Amino acid sequence: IVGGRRARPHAWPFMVSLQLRGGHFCGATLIAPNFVMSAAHCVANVNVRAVRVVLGAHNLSRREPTRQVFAVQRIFENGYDPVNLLNDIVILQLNGSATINANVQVAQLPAQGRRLGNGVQCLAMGWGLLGRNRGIASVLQELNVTVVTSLCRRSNVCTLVRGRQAGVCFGDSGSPLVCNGLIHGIASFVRGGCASGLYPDAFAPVAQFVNWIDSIIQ
Ligand SMILES: *[C@@H]1O[C@H](CO[C@@H]2O[C@@H](C)[C@@H](O)[C@@H](O)[C@@H]2O)[C@@H](O[C@@H]2O[C@H](CO)[C@@H](O)[C@H](O)[C@H]2NC(C)=O)[C@H](O)[C@H]1NC(C)=O
Ligand SMILES: *[C@@H]1O[C@H](CO)[C@@H](O[C@@H]2O[C@H](CO)[C@@H](O)[C@H](O)[C@H]2NC(C)=O)[C@H](O)[C@H]1NC(C)=O
Ligand SMILES: *S(=O)(=O)c1ccccc1S(=O)(=O)F
Numbered sequence: 001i002v003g004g005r006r007a008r009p010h011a012w013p014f015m016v017s018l019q020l021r022g023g024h025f026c027g028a029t030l031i032a033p034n035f036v037m038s039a040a041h042c043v044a045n046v047n048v049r050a051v052r053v054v055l056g057a058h059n060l061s062r063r064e065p066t067r068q069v070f071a072v073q074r075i076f077e078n079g080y081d082p083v084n085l086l087n088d089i090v091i092l093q094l095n096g097s098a099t100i101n102a103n104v105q106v107a108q109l110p111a112q113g114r115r116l117g118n119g120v121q122c123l124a125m126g127w128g129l130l131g132r133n134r135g136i137a138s139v140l141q142e143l144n145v146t147v148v149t150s151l152c153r154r155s156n157v158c159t160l161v162r163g164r165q166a167g168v169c170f171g172d173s174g175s176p177l178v179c180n181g182l183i184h185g186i187a188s189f190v191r192g193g194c195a196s197g198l199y200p201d202a203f204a205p206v207a208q209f210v211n212w213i214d215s216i217i218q
Pocket of ligand 1: 122123144179180181182
């Protein structure tokens with residue numbers, strides 16, 4: 001996240017860190033005690049058997065007793081297009097079930113086909129790059145963004161920060177877009193580089209996949 005602010009500890013207890021060798025590389029969302037969702041391109045060309053699913057994290061540089069760590073058991077994708085980044089969503093079944101508490105919670109998703117119009121106010125979040133030559137963030141970041149429909153495909157939800165250069169960046173991919181308490185997006189791609197102030201950020205449209213998601217997580 002470029003141009004945001006520190007999230008307060010465990011403000012978003014559905015926020016997930018996907019890690020290789022103890023290293024964050026993508027975000028995700030807890031959508032059931034034993035399932036997370038993230039972007040498909042995050043687990044493409046990656047050894048998924050080595051990926052750790054980290055719940056209850058806040059600071060990537062500290063030892064955190066609030067964490068619960070799982071592994072990936074099953075993978076579900078529904079027509080993911082690696083060229084056009086269509087259907088850039090993956091569901092990952094965990095090798096166990098999370099203990100639901102104050103710091104680890106299941107996100108709420110919208111109804112199937114639910115659409116957000118221009119101007120709606122949302123919150124993006126993630127541990128991604130803080131800016132050019134600044135590296136990924138230790139502390140979970142959040143960013144007020146606004147839904148836009150210009151420069152956006154009907155198969156995405158797109159957002160832009162008005163008035164300054166801000167947006168999601170490398171490392172934020174897979175992270176939830178939250179609008180009115182519901183997860184409407186999964187960070188999918190940027191254009192013209194991160195925080196260009198010109199191209200909106202693109203999210204996988206979670207609402208278009210709700211029936212499919214439910215048929216898996218029941
Ligand atoms: C910046 O965003 C915060 C947080 O946004 C709301 O909550 C998110 C989780 C998500 O659901 C968004 O779609 C929501 O817009 C805003 O804080 C809200 O602020 C109002 C007062 O203006 C307050 O009554 C609400 O309780 C706040 N909600 C939360 C969860 O804190 C804030 O207003 C936004 N500010 C700007 C300038 O964009
Ligand atoms: C689910 O998979 C995780 C991933 O390894 C298991 O977690 C570890 O738990 C063992 C206990 O046997 C510890 O020795 C390791 O240090 C843990 N690893 C990490 C990275 O935390 C977990 O036990 C599995 N749960 C079930 C129910 O199978
Ligand atoms: S991801 O958040 O879409 C992302 C953003 C900015 C640069 C690269 C990436 S990546 O595709 O995950 F690498």
